[PDB]
Swiss-Prot record, chain B:
Binds to host ACE2. RBD also interacts with the N-linked glycan on 'Asn-90' of ACE2. Cleavage of S generates a polybasic C-terminal sequence on S1 that binds to host Neuropilin-1 (NRP1) and Neuropilin-2 (NRP2) receptors. Interacts with host integrin alpha-5/beta-1 (ITGA5:ITGB1) and with ACE2 in complex with integrin alpha-5/beta-1 (ITGA5:ITGB1). May interact via cytoplasmic c-terminus with M protein. May interact (via N-terminus) with host bilirubin and biliverdin, thereby preventing antibody binding to the SARS-CoV-2 spike NTD via an allosteric mechanism. This is Spike protein S1. Attaches the virion to the cell membrane by interacting with host receptor, initiating the infection. The major receptor is host ACE2. When S2/S2' has been cleaved, binding to the receptor triggers direct fusion at the cell membrane. When S2/S2' has not been cleaved, binding to the receptor results in internalization of the virus by endocytosis using host TFRC and GRM2 and leading to fusion of the virion membrane with the host endosomal membrane. Alternatively, may use NRP1/NRP2 and integrin as entry receptors. Changing V9E: In strain: Omicron/XBB.1.5, Omicron/EG.5.1. Changing D14G: In strain: Beta/B.1.351. The chain holds residues 204 to 248 of 1273 of the full protein. It comes from Severe acute respiratory syndrome coronavirus 2. Changing I7V: In strain: Omicron/BA.2.75. Glycans are attached at N33. The lineage of its organism: Viruses, Riboviria, Orthornavirae, Pisuviricota, Pisoniviricetes.
């Protein structure tokens, strides 16, 4: 996917690797290389009106 | 899926009526069919 990767304060239990939002879309992940909790936020967007 | 806690319940027959969750502890990849289960007890010597 495409988004902004940041550190996340949400604590994952040791078995947990993925996090999901209300919309059932992946919102957080654990990096395969180093076990760390990272949340994904979509890149900035907004309607444009002239 | 296991979980351990300390309990101070007065009635041993009465499991606590408190909400709890059992985390996924271990998985075994073997797919051997199992029909019957036997609890294993430790019992050493006359004292
Ligand atoms: C290889 O993978 C393990 C599991 O994530 C990790 O702990 C280890 O640091 C990795 N090796 C290197 C050199 O980073």
């Amino acid at each position: 996917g495409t988004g902004v990767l940041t550190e996340s304060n949400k604590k994952f239990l040791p078995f947990q690797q993925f996090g999901r939002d209300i919309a059932d879309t992946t919102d957080a992940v654990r990096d395969p290389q180093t076990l760390e909790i990272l949340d994904i936020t979509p890149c900035s967007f907004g309607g444009v009106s002239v | 899926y296991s979980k351990h806690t300390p309990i101070i319940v007065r009635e041993p027959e009465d499991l606590p009526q408190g909400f709890s969750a059992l985390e996924p502890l271990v998985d075994l990849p073997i797919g051997i069919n199992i029909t019957r289960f036997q609890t294993l007890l430790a019992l050493h010597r006359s004292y």
